[PDB]
């Protein structure tokens, strides 16, 4: 049941719409599928993608891989793999996709879904719908957040951080018209405020009307001196922090008491790490986007976990069952694994060796998730 | 493959010799045996000891762990019990001994020995003589040790805190007429010390020309500030602590920056999370006492983890093989689950399932592990 | 004047209506009573009672008392060990009982009402109406709380901490329905909320028109942080903060600045010594359910306390005359000792010295204290 | 049993040596015993003692006691009153003679000694020689000592804190000259030294070849940041703490840190309450000086108390019979109450009811304690 081979296919594609925040753009998606095959058969899946940069070429990927990580894991079983304790003591982001993928493969291997191997007591989540939407125009960001709605989200999330504070204004009252009311709102400026100016637009937030479930990493996250004295003034919403940090930051965060709540992403060991000591803290913990949703597992098997992002991207055509999202629930399924099987006929018509120009990309998949 | 039975059987015998430290006697064991059944046919192993009190008989124990155990375990994976992150917020001492059994029978269930389980590069650590020899008399004292120091330990810990402290010294003075030159020594005073009381103390141990690898719970294990004074200014030995600390409480302990060494015992799911914990900080651990050496799997998969305890306890007749130590070495076995297998032999001949009183044990089981 | 005997009788019966809170529900009492006698022919009382598991039989309880706790015990006065200061340094709860008992003894062994020789001014303490109520049907809520308001209570605390917060809003709506205008209000989340989730749902209390005297235990009680947090924030309320800490727990709590308010329940001698503490401090100390209302006389004892809890239970009828509750005062009796004396008639009818089941149990106890 | 009447008898005689300590000193003593009588006949007597400044006429103590004191006391029981928690919130020193008497009082009543009723499991603590010397003379210094030793004291007290260090050195030369090789030595500074000068002369003892015991105020008892430098850095000898403080204040030298052990006098209810706190936190106590020995029964009850200090002074003459002190150790007898009761002779010869100057004190009662 021990690892064997490694397969790389890599893609970069447009996208269905401009996303990104107060700090970056991006129309295009780069993305490779990891995949860590073992000799019973049974193939573990994940993803390894960049976020400002194109990958290199499907060659460039594979040899720093099979020079990088690969002799840490050939010949072992993913499930000793997930449990190895390492102390602090890449060319390529490949801790994420790694992590997924061992843990795929070791929940298939036990035969069972991934939640289920990872302890939960239940299958479904909250999901709330994100925007990733600064980029969008007016006319972009009604049609989604009321698309939202139509299919029963209840919870919203906008970028804001606008240089003119009467841009996020204005988007929370577009919001406001698009959505049933009572809707559940966060806001995400992305570190675009320093902390006095985070409070006092808060402040006029909340004096026009808004009641927010959070505002998201509002300033410098090493400002742990500010985060503090949010946490300590905002007393009507909460104070959701942890982007751009690794395990050890977000250790270091906690240490820090510098968040009303801790928001991950899709590392699954250090997940489960950090969901660990935030329950024995009391800090709650909320899952982002995680590509194509696979983080669906550890949301629905940690207990202080409420919320998973969804950001509607055109990513489904890339694999042949996408996790389920109904009525503002997201579903982890009772396949085995993490339940994200790539479509071979999507390895065949979308991948792309060879590192493109931006203008050499095509037409953008299409995107059923959103009209 | 999940678990549908439960078995116990209860422990109580005589010691071959006086065990027992500045606190506490004793020269009995009550112990019982837990077994995990899964609809597989494998079987988990974990024992349940108290070891300030016996334990009620078999009947009573059985029942309480019906009432009050069982219905979170029945019908579940082994393997999917083991990852569970509860939320912080038993009439007797099951916690050890689930977790014991529970990894016993997931690494059975995936074909592993537990250590490669827990994600191990090694299998072996070295191990120490540890006496428990307070209440020992000093013909005994040398007996002990010189027969650990003959097969080849290395590293020897005594008891200490007598009321009159050159009893301490009398007993190094002691441990040193029977051991190489050049051996690692230790000493647990048990907490029969204030913290000043203890620096000079070691002040004296020192120029008395005995040299210390640690020393073990000196003071009361809530005065933290006594701790990181001896921390600060012991600048020849380590402070090793943690006894008597649940999990919380240790994870308070690393907090406090109060150990130098943290002492660990048998929780298997517990002890893989602050060691990752402790790994993350630079804090190195060492496993005490476990049932049978059951921990010597953990010892061995943390990376910081250097020492195991070993108190040629009379406990070998109740398992088919006991895990093996050669030259100061033990070793996690090539085997499925953590190698201990109950002997069925010994539950006929020592399984005691009326609570007795100590004038009806009889004759200690021998101890081949002692002359 | 010394001890001589113990006698151990076991209750195990049904209650008149489901108990709880956020976290736990029983419908069943399980209480022993714990009677030492002296030489002098005079008695102590305490009680023994487990909330999660019933009691063992008698039998078990009797046995493991004799080997636990009975050598400290016997051949000694009550007022010298209720004296004894321990360094730090049971298989039942026998704690609580043993104290009650040590001190009931005691005080009548001197001829006086326990609060008298607890150095008492005072013979009484506000009493508010505690439902306990997190599971009653809204018909069997207000029909406690109106019974509450119709015999002389102007305090009331209900359980909250509802998955849905819609259902503490209403309870609290509810309750407004059922008491005179200007009544005192407590909740009770029972660890529920999280630190920033507590302080809003505090805030959409207050906006919604609810004035609280004070909020118990809202979070994780290990969680100084977020308690501080809340200190600092809610300037129009008291966080009131103890539950299920020990004495060394309420002190480490003190410590950190916690609690506005320190909760206590019956353990006579370490609520006499935390309430020194306190008085020092300038902390504040409510009296939580005792057993048939025995910490009474601490209640009146203390300076620093104002309220005591009063919960309806159908217990009274386990013993003579229980401790008078007029008009919202619960009034410390002039009887020697506690003026707890068990009911002969009650010790025939209600003894169970054998565990049953839960069907088992018979109709409840009559419960006179409700209608 | 309640009080109905007082007694005040006023003392004032010369001393039979000089006392004193580098701050000051005295060659006479105003004492004046306070008798609290209960309705049982039963009487208690505490030791109204003035250091500084001499006691007012008889007529004045006892106006002041009525008008201040009295109206609390009357009326009462006092196993009542000494139990009594009052809030923080004399004209003359009445608060360790109350407190004195009326335990003395409340122990007869219960027909106990008082070290039995403050829960004690032992009867003797070791008891160290303290020659209050610093004015003594280098003849009169050895005379004192080599008593002492030969009577079989082990331990030795010496005031140190001259302008001439040498004069330090000289007397634990002289120290050592008259006492038995192996003795314990202490030294009291009495606040004589700024914290860092404390520390360089410590070295220089220590280098000088003389193993101290403790050091006992040697620095401003308020200068926490001194104390704690000292406690840290002095890793061969404790910093013994705590002189000129209140049950407040000792309560705060304890949150800073402040003492590696805590010394206390005579005040019972107080020392009982420091002690318990002592106990939780790990900090050794001594007592000091109390009048005729009356601590010894706080001494020998408080687990973390090991020394009582014994200073020669010619007073038994005052009482029936004095404490017994035998080898260096100090018995608490196995008489109702502290066992100590007036002489009537004594009562007679030795009143004296008005104030007079230090020249018409007359010759000094016989020390028989003393060659």
Redesign the interface.
């Known amino acids: 049941?021990s690892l064997s081979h490694f397969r790389i296919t890599r893609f970069q594609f447009a996208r269905d719409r401009v996303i990104g925040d107060s700090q970056v753009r991006a129309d295009d998606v780069n993305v490779a599928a990891l995949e860590l095959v073992s000799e019973s058969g049974e193939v573990g899946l994940g993803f390894i993608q960049t976020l400002f940069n194109p990958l290199p070429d499907q060659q460039e990927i594979e040899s720093v891989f099979e020079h990088e990580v690969w002799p840490s894991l050939k010949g072992n079983?993913a499930?000793?793999?997930?449990?190895?304790?390492?102390?602090?003591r890449y060319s390529l982001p490949f801790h994420e996709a790694v992590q997924v993928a061992l843990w795929d493969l070791a929940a298939k291997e036990?035969?069972?879904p991934l939640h289920?191997?990872?302890?939960s007591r239940r299958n479904r989540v909250k999901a709330y719908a994100s925007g990733l939407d600064f980029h969008l125009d007016d006319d972009a960001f009604v049609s989604l957040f009321s698309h939202a709605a139509s299919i029963g989200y209840s919870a919203f999330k906008i970028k804001v951080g606008h240089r003119d504070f009467d841009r996020d204004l204005r988007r929370l009252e577009l919001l406001k018209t698009c959505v049933p009311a009572g809707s559940k709102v966060m806001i995400d400026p992305n570190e675009a405020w320093t902390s006095k100016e985070a409070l006092t637009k808060l402040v006029a937030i909340r004096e026009a009307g808004h009641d927010l479930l959070w505002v998201e990493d509002p300033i410098l996250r090493h400002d742990h001196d500010g985060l503090r004295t949010l946490?300590?003034?905002v007393?009507?919403?909460?104070?959701n922090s942890g982007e751009y940090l690794d395990?050890?930051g977000k250790?270091l965060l906690l240490?820090a008491?510098a968040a009303?709540?801790l928001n991950v992403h899709g590392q699954v060991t250090d997940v489960?790490?950090i969901?660990?000591?935030a329950?024995?803290?009391?800090?709650?913990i909320s899952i982002g986007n995680t590509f194509l949703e696979a983080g669906v597992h550890m949301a629905v098997?940690?207990?202080?976990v409420e919320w998973l992002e969804y950001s509607f991207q055109n990513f489904d055509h890339l694999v042949e069952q996408p996790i389920e999202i109904r009525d503002g629930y997201a579903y982890a399924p009772d396949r085995p694994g993490h339940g994200l099987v790539l479509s071979e006929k999507a390895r065949g018509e979308w991948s792309r060796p060879r590192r493109l120009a931006r203008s050499e990309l095509g037409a953008a998949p299409e995107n059923p998730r959103l009209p």
């Open positions: 049941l079983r499930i000793a793999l997930v449990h190895r304790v390492n102390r602090p036990a035969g069972l289920v191997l990872l302890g946490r300590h003034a007393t009507w919403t909460q104070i395990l050890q250790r240490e008491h009303d709540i489960m790490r969901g660990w000591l329950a024995e803290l009391g800090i709650p098997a940690l207990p202080e």
